[PDB]
Amino acid sequence: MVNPTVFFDIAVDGEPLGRVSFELFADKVPKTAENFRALSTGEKGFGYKGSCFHRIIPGFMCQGGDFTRHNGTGGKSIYGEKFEDENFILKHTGPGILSMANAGPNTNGSQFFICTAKTEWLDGKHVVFGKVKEGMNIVEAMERFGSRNGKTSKKITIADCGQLE
Ligand SMILES: CCCN(Cc1ccc(N)cc1)C(=O)NCC(=O)OCC
User: Fold this and answer.
1) Could you tell me at which residue positions the Glycyl lysine isopeptide (Lys-Gly) (interchain with G-Cter in SUMO2) crosslink is annotated in this chain?
2) What is the CATH number of domain 1-165?
3) Of 111, 117, 132, 157, which is least surrounded by CB within 10 A?
């Protein structure tokens, strides 16, 4: 019944910054929520722990989840390399929205982004599946290490991640 919660412990050039937690909307997008949850716990033997936010654009979003190529060209889901767009019920309404990155229709893997602005033009193209619950202040701190082209000025990593009770 209850939507699961996951956390990321963020580091900046290896130095701890803080925690971001997310509510995953399993009630509306169970398949997509389950992929992110499982990648966050690492229970399939692969996932987000140790990966980086490779693209951060202030006033837009923070993108991560590429644990196979580390640069925005890789990643894989718990269902295989790719899976379908589950639905587009939820919209990109503002800062804190958690949504899947993709390379065309039905190409979800492991890459995701956290919005730092309303990104309405992505509605119906990227599957929204969660939101920041606590630590939007930490997301805003991460965002300051981005740039217009997305290259980060320090290495922004998920030092630890998992599921909260
Ligand atoms: C041709 C670029 C596709 N990629 C990289 C990507 C590669 C594989 C997967 N599974 C997801 C994204 C993208 O990052 N596309 C843009 C995007 O998703 O932005 C969200 C705000």
Assistant:
1) 28, 82
2) 2.40.100.10
3) 117
